[PDB]
Symmetry: C3
Subunit: 455 residues, 3 copies
């Protein structure tokens, strides 16, 4: 008979819907195609990024640690299930003891020798009241939790390598713009050096033009540092090196990522891997309270073995020398000092700390999906205002170019308009990077990318 | 007899007082009332913040994990001291053993059937040389360590909810100031648009106005994202949601928190939770070294049982047959080839490990008090300076408004004055936030967020 | 007869050499002297750092926790080694079994009595199959992992105290520069106050100069608290206080850190501490696989002791009551419930988990040293441009001073020049602190400071 108590899923401390406000959008209350049913291959529309996901799925090491830990706790489940069945094993035995004058059968102090080679089982208990079955349920549900933690490790891997490639892709263009700013500053210094060599400009404007080009060289070396360190932070996450068969990836000024419907706060509890990892931890916990409840009842321990036993070693086997042994045994405690009740209360509040950690996990998941929704609501006008800034500075630069080309104003104010346009382009790229980074983090927060394609 | 070592605390590696230089004002010497017994109701003078902390102490989840691990180690202590008392309980033994005729005293190979229920104890050990009571002392003192760890979890949770609420308030004030700057740039852009339509301002000034207003719209969208970010962080630190029954909270410029005395560096040794849990873990190691010392000495064991063992299938409770077994056992390990000596060495250097972790914890506590005392010593001479900057820019705007309403300068210079005044007020509130979060961290470092009221 | 499989270390997932491009430097061949054998007293060329880092290694406490954990696992190795040898001891006894009348040999209920002390071993198992030797190898190789985990802790402590001392010097230098800018701003303010009383300047330029002065006072205070905060970080990281007999340390203008040959990625597999730590964890699991495989085979347990037995305690010291006992009780399993194969492939995939840990640790080490190589190849051409900026601004200030002394521009343009020069010097101090912390992290990533001088 079993003794595991029943289970109801606890009411999460999440509210009814996602939070509303000036930052957020409007909720679509449908769950037709959720996020975890959308694979990463349809979500990411950059093919070299897709093969970087495909090579980081196979040549990583943290995902390998997780995918080996799931079969490690599968083996732990196999040994905790194997404790249920008996231990049929051949065990030899013998004795050569002297007995004194009072313990011997003869009366004179002499020795006696008895040897035994049998087959059977020692120190095994019959599971009649559900204890090792409860340990088996605890190990099974630890195995299920470890599988879901492997899924969580793959989601937090694919989000990290996606945002690492997005940071590297943005910083390539950052270096490309910083080289053009260095070119504009260098040509401004060349014009001020020509104006100093003839006599129009003094040395003060020459120094003030020189300090700007050394500032441009300093920040150029800074962005080369940051590009190289982000290449190293990417080649850590891939495990293997960057491949040489890269297809032509898309530009950063396009739609790299598709939109995902957020859904309801009750859509997390069925498909988010970390919170139902915590739910299977709670499953192991109430299997453990089912184990601790079975410590009160008696445990039928049966130690049976059948073989041969003889005094003489000259005869290995004989028809008479064959023997068996049965030995039934029951044991229930009567009056302890409370160690059974202390273990029962210990397992009960292990279940209680695991339900506390479960609802803490759903609170953290709801917090990260909530500020992911806030970023989805705000970047769609932040980046649009930044594009209007870019169009305004681009019209300013082309208007300054078409008033330079006639001949009204000199080339130095044209370089000033050009470096202002380049600063605006750098701000546009470092804001599009934050939009794509938080969208990848929202995709990880909803249900993550586990499967390859949709279902 | 018990043989745990006679204990004295290690001396605290600190200075005799807090450091004094240009940054630190002056230490206060002996505190009359210490920093620990100032509850969070007579310390946080904001009533809305007091209700927020009152929700966070009853709805957040890490506090529940710690405040149920305290009963987990209650149950661990109870089972560890219940191991000492005898485990009396009925058991029914038995042999159904075929026994060969050469082993038989009768002569023919026959069986023997002796089985019967019997009440008593199996392998009960007495700690008369003091190992089990030392393990009891170890379990009790690491239970007290987990008690102090629960107090540390509470006094970190109060500080975290306070810092989240203060960052949320400062971000709402920054949202209001940047919304005012966006309003002033729209009030500049429509004037520049009319000056472009009538023909005075060229299109370059119009593109500069578009540059300014789209930069301010991007900054407004960034801050209205970040308000929702830290609001969801406050939702996580509460556990529950924000209640709708709140009073009117205090502002930033008003006195939000009260004064707390620092004291000696010898108050952290008594009234700080992590130092006390390191101390009680050192206590538990000082009991484990006593267990390893008592492992040398003899450990006697008494096992006895009373019942019936009549040799019949149908005869169990028959008058005139009562089993009365009473077997003691002594033991003394003479030669162990360096196992028990290695166990005593291991327990002694575990005690040394806990001494090292105790002094590491007290130095981390000393440093996180000392940097907060440095911030309280010199942030006044920054806040007064930034307040004088805000006052100087305010009277600068008042003189620019006098020049405008007289009629000397146009409206755009008044908008530049409002730009400078809004930048000054934004710098003032982002410094007041740093002050308040640093002295909240100072109050957490002195260890006073535990109790509800004062003493 | 041991069953541990013979090992060869896994091939490195790193590439053939360090990566090269435009940011990286062109690497040399192999190392004449390796990076871990570079003189630790010869690497840091400051007097003060070299005298303070001995106090750092002698009085910091995570290093002491590691250097006591190495003795802890030495004692655990001695326990696991002494478990192989027998454990002989006085196995005392004594039985008083009031047996019923049907089981006693006389036919009447009587008292059965045995007594006596007995010297010898009990339940000791012969380790001729490689089980306890494999557990001894597991303990020995975890000891050898922790012995260089202590070296890794010493490495990161040396790197952390070097970065803390360098950021202390950099914050004191930029504190001095901020104090000089506060002096120049105060001179600008009282010149504008002198030019305000007689009526040359209105009450707008005076307010602008006043806002500049209070901005300087706020900046001076927020650098004073930063100096007092990282000095407290350094006095945490030393453990003891800063000593008073400090020799004069040479500043950031001269050289501080010698050149270190990086070498090859094959050189990193023999001298970096945590790589060999993961290799010894791998070998510990590769001994645990032999420990799991050695349970298929028949274990050879033995029980042997020799004592004197009698009916009463008066017949203990009796010539003719001596006896012995000799029980070779072997055992061998023939039917398990898959537990043996589960333990076998469980230890096999634990070996594969530690393989994945090892070739993840090499990837993290290669990422750290590749970041160091990028910084070493780029900070030279960053700071050459930055010192050209400082030289250009300095001779700009010299031209402005030789413009001022003849009396054609004000003192306020001289203060503009001093503003430019001091901002240039402050940016130079920050970039050189970046170079020094990146090169200290390179020295931590290659081989660390463990050898006290050049080996």
């Amino acid at each position: 008979c079993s003794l595991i108590p029943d289970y109801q899923r606890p009411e999460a401390p999440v509210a009814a819907a996602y939070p509303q406000g000036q930052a957020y959008g409007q909720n679509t209350g449908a769950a037709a195609v959720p996020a975890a049913d959308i694979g990463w291959r349809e979500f990411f529309r950059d093919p070299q990024l897709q093969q970087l996901i495909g090579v980081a799925l196979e040549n990583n090491r943290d995902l390998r640690v997780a995918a080996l830990n799931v079969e490690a706790f599968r083996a732990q489940y196999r040994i905790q299930r194997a404790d249920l069945f008996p231990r049929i094993g051949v065990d030899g035995s013998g004795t050569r003891q002297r007995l004194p004058g009072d313990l011997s059968t003869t009366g004179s102090p002499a020795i006696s020798s008895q040897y035994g080679v049998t087959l059977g089982t020692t120190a095994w208990e019959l599971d009649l009241f559900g204890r090792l079955r409860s340990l088996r349920d605890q190990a099974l549900e630890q195995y299920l939790a470890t599988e879901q933690a492997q899924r969580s490790a793959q989601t937090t891997l694919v989000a990290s390598v996606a945002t690492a490639y997005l940071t590297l892709k943005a910083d390539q263009a950052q270096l490309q713009l910083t080289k053009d700013t260095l070119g504009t500053y260098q040509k401004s210094f060349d014009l001020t050096q020509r104006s100093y060599d003839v006599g129009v400009a003094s040395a003060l404007d020459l120094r003030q033009a020189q300090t700007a080009v050394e500032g441009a060289r300093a920040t150029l070396a800074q962005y080369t540092r940051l590009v190289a360190q982000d290449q190293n932070a990417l080649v850590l996450l891939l495990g293997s090196g960057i491949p040489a068969n890269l297809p032509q990836g898309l530009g950063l000024d396009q739609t790299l990522l598709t939109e995902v419907p957020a859904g309801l706060p009750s859509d997390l509890l069925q498909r988010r891997p970390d919170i139902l990892e915590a739910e299977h931890q709670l499953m192991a916990a109430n299997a453990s309270i089912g184990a601790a409840r079975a410590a009160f009842f008696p445990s039928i321990s049966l130690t049976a073995n059948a073989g041969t036993m003889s005094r003489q070693l000259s005869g290995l086997f004989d028809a008479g020398s064959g023997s068996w042994l049965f030995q039934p045994s029951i044991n229930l405690p009567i009056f302890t000092a409370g160690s059974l009740r202390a273990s029962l209360d210990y397992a009960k509040i292990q279940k209680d700390i695991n339900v506390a950690q479960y609802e803490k996990a759903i609170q953290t998941a709801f917090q990260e999906v909530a500020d992911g929704l806030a970023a989805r609501g705000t970047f769609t006008e932040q980046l649009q205002a930044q594009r209007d800034l870019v169009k305004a500075s681009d019209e300013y630069y082309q208007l300054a170019d078409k008033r330079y080309r006639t001949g009204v104003d000199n080339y130095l104010t044209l370089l000033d308009a050009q470096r202002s346009l380049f600063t605006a382009q750098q701000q546009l790229i470092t804001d599009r990077l934050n939009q794509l980074t938080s969208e990848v983090n929202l995709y990880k927060a909803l249900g993550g990318g586990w499967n390859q394609q949709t279902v």
